[PDB]
């Protein structure tokens, strides 16, 4: 019986994903989809806000897309509780989050463009957000996509726990690189081998270097360390151990740094087995340390018997120790994907219509 | 500025540890307590509904408690959003969850015999709090305490995940025995020694047979399996293997059944260095197997990389293995004690009263 509007603006997979599981959706709370962006310059949408037939929106008329100032006071004049899906990474949408909160738009968002900018923009959403009539901002997505990772980290703080350490492997194609080079075993596998096979394989991008340099990692750091306390400025802002090797950052074609790459598998081979001759393995870790204040994103030695150290394939991590949690609470699973990710959103997006709803 | 009203029903050390969290909460909703009763017999509530000093109500006049009839008719006369949190393990205010959905309360516990009973009493809860006007029922800290397991397993089957394989260590005190007893080395170390230390070590209670007879463990699993879908009719539909000899069984003293229990310290040490033999750790999960459309909870063979075969004492774990989780959704992490179980109590009542609140 209770219904709010919504208003899909995505692209990808991931998009595709998250229209087909809402259009399967059996929810008591009801969605009434009233604009929805296909691509970047079309999307569909009625004057009289007529729902969105989410089984043809592909060979439904569509218009030109609705400027962002103009989709709220398009959203506004519905005279109904909305919530805004950003399925993107658009910076420039991501910058619209204030005007969208303001308006009493809600957001769900795997985007993380927003909360791993300036600490400003972080403080100025949730401050709009917990403002009277502000929009809620629910992003579970962003770190470890559909995994239960910010909102039971939220319920810590807010209950009043303490954390004081938060380690994880927040990057699927970087957790397969490391699963497949160092295990507790000899192994002569090669680091450029792996990244090759990785590339074809689909977990790095057809440059490998946009994933290699550890940045997009440490955006997800930066945002549990800002949930957690750790109020970081900026990605920038602290250490990043970039994979890509100094000499080949200048290389502008891909093809160029995949050749020159391999002549630094014996810098990576002696690493590992030097790491192995003290009965440890590699990983490429994000680590929020309240105790040594630090927040830092590079590779790290872990035991055998870590939880860290038998991580199978792509699998995403994260340990969160506190007050309450001596021992730490421990999250894995596969922190990527087109249906996992929109596993996140839509969960996200029930959430706030059972609150704004009616 | 909006805020709800609350009933605290509570004993021992849970719910003095559920008051001073929510004493210390800084929520953007507010939260009056109306009703506490301390005691079986004692509970300080006002004509006027008055607020409780939670800093002070163990020095409050106190009146006679109020029926669960009678509370009810209490707490619906203001006509205000209503919580009642039960932190009991009784039976008699379980019985009555019906009764208070019906009317409009909404139910925040870690109390699972309504959910661990016949699954007709399932039913008839979540259909009155489905029903209009009915009050929500939050239950996070009845599987695994304040650990994110019933949350994120409700949001899959929410969203159309279609689960498969649910496996778990859900009892803290069957975890430390099975893990200082089964390892990948060799150990002479006997059931008995291992069961004496959790005797009087507060691990196990006053009987032990009390903690493993696995029937505790069978009521999570009942929770777990439910809401994935497996509709099990109650903790006694399918095997529970007791780890209490049957013989010993027909004792009436705890310490009785210790000392006649090492008769089968040597079957256990046949059944653990056979699994050796293996390279199997034994273990005491519970498991919810669609595919095979059987629940169990008893002892199991797992291998040395399984996650299952390196636990940080008493920590539990759960595995949700889906159809978007090929490798499963692994939680794992400190599965009781009053803060952390309070906490799981307080994320709960936070949550209701974010969606009812006026």
Known sequence: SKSVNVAIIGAGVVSSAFINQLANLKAPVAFKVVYLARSSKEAVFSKDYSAVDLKNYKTAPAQAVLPLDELTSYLTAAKRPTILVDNT????????????????????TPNKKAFSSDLATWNDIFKKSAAANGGLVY???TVGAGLPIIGPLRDLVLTGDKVEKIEGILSGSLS???????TSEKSDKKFSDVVKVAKDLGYLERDPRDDLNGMDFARKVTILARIAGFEVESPNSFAVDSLVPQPLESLATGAEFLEKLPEYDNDFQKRKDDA???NKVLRYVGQV????????????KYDFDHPFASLKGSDNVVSIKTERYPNPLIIQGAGAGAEVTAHGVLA???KIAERIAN
């Open 176 to 182: 397969y690189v490391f699963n497949t080079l160092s």
């Open 276 to 278: 192995l001759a003290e």
């Open 348 to 350: 996200d997006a029930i």
């Open 89 to 108: 990474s658009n910076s420039s949408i991501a910058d619209f989050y204030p005007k969208f909160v303001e308006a009493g738009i809600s957001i769900a």
């Open 289 to 300: 340390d309240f105790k040594a204040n630090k927040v830092s994103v590079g590779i790290a």
């Open 139 to 141: 992003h579970e997505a």
